[PDB]
Structure formats: structure tokens, C-alpha cells
Design a protein. Structure first.
Length: 222
């Protein structure tokens, strides 16, 4: 299908390359999504049921909502705002991800693909160790780059690639996303000045959310 799985994929890249520069795109975002729309995306951390309306959404709306949150953070790059943006989107993306048949190489920003066939020879051994058969494979070096503390020795390698259970794919890919969220938020600090009253409002709306979220779980239960 044509659904956004990774807002940093080559797909998304040329999709937002169309509005011209990152700045031209950045000026257009406020003319496409509202603020209540963007915060709508973040409140997913609260009600699981909020997730569904996102499972299928136009890609430009996604990128727009997404890069709105990112721009709102160019003004506050560390706290729970950066924490929330990551968490909320990570759910929206993981969710869509974990329910995709084939995975087109341009839809994801790391060399990952689906394992259609699995070597007959090792099927049992694998199961008598991990139960199921991993559904995906990934480029060994990407793996080493994303999860430095782990050991290839604990996974199955074949034909030059590492095989991973759906869980591991997401877990691993999450490290690539969080890094990208950061590489991106800081590349927006350069022009964070040319940004419209919009981005700063979105930021204030996120702050307000966190306080509500925090204020509730700390004064709750009674």
C-alpha cells in the first residue's frame, strides 16, 4: 500500500522534496494542518483507541502533522516534549508497521525486508530455540549500527543478513527513528526563527498536555 511507515524514508523524502526546501515545506504545514489536529496525534499516548483513525491517513497529512511537532520542538529539544513526540509517533508508526505484508525498500529508512522463504535445513533448530520463525531480515551493518550493545551471536544469520522476529524489528527500528527525530529536530534549530506563530503555538499545546498528563498521574488514585 501507500501508507507512511517511516517519515524519514526515501519515500517521504521526495514527498516533502516537492514543496521545495525544508523552509518552503515548513511554511506550508501551517496552511494544511491545524494545531488541534497535531495535538490530536500526541494524545494517542493516553487512549489506545486514538490509534486507529491514524492507521490509514494520507501521507502528506502524516508528514505535515509530524514535521509540525518536530518544528514545535526546535524551541524545546530535550524535555518530555521531545520524549512525547517520539513516543506518540513511535506508536502510530510501529502500529502501521506491524501490520504490513511486503515492506518496500523505499518505505523504510533502514535496509530491512520481509523473509519470504526460510532455509528448510534450520527450521526446527530455530523453533527449538525461539519458538516461531523470524519474519524479517535486515542488513547486518545496520543492525550493528543501531544496537551496539547486542550480539549477532544471539540471532540467526543467512545469506548475509540477520533474521528478526517482528518484535525485534520494531524494537531495533525504534532506535533508528528516535535518532532521526533528533537529527531532524536540531536541523530545524537553524531556521527556527523563520517559523510562523504556528510552531510556537503547537509547542505550548504539547507542554499543556504533559502538565495535564503529569498533574493527573501524580495527584490521581483516591
Amino acid at each position: 500500500m501507500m501508507i507512511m511507515l517511516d517519515p524519514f524514508s526515501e519515500k517521504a523524502k521526495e514527498l516533502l522534496k516537492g514543496f521545495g526546501s525544508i523552509n518552503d515545506f515548513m511554511d506550508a504545514i501551517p496552511k494544511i494542518v491545524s494545531v488541534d489536529d497535531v495535538i490530536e496525534r500526541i494524545r494517542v499516548v493516553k487512549n489506545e483507541k486514538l490509534i486507529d483513525k491514524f492507521l490509514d491517513q494520507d501521507n502528506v497529512m502524516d508528514l505535515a502533522q509530524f514535521y509540525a511537532l518536530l518544528g514545535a520542538l526546535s524551541y524545546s529539544p530535550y524535555g518530555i516534549e521531545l520524549e512525547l513526540v517520539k513516543k506518540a509517533n513511535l506508536i502510530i508508526y510501529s502500529e502501521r508497521l506491524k501490520r504490513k505484508k511486503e515492506i518496500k525498500p523505499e518505505e523504510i529508512s533502514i535496509d530491512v525486508s520481509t523473509a519470504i522463504e526460510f532455509p528448510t535445513e534450520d527450521v526446527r533448530k530455530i523453533e527449538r530455540v525461539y519458538g516461531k520463525i523470524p519474519e524479517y531480515t535486515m542488513k547486518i551493518s545496520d543492525f550493528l549500527d543501531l544496537v551496539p550493545d547486542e550480539k549477532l551471536a544471539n540471532y540467526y544469520i543467512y545469506e548475509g543478513r540477520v533474521y528478526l522476529k517482528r518484535e525485534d524489528l520494531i524494537r531495533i527500528w525504534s532506535k533508528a527513528f528516535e535518532r532521526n527525530v533528533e537529527r531532524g529536530v536540531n536541523m530545524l534549530y537553524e531556521i527556527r526563527d523563520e517559523l510562523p506563530e504556528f510552531y510556537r503555538k503547537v509547542l505550548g499545546e504539547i507542554q499543556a498536555f504533559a502538565e495535564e498528563e503529569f498533574g493527573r498521574k501524580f495527584g490521581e488514585i483516591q
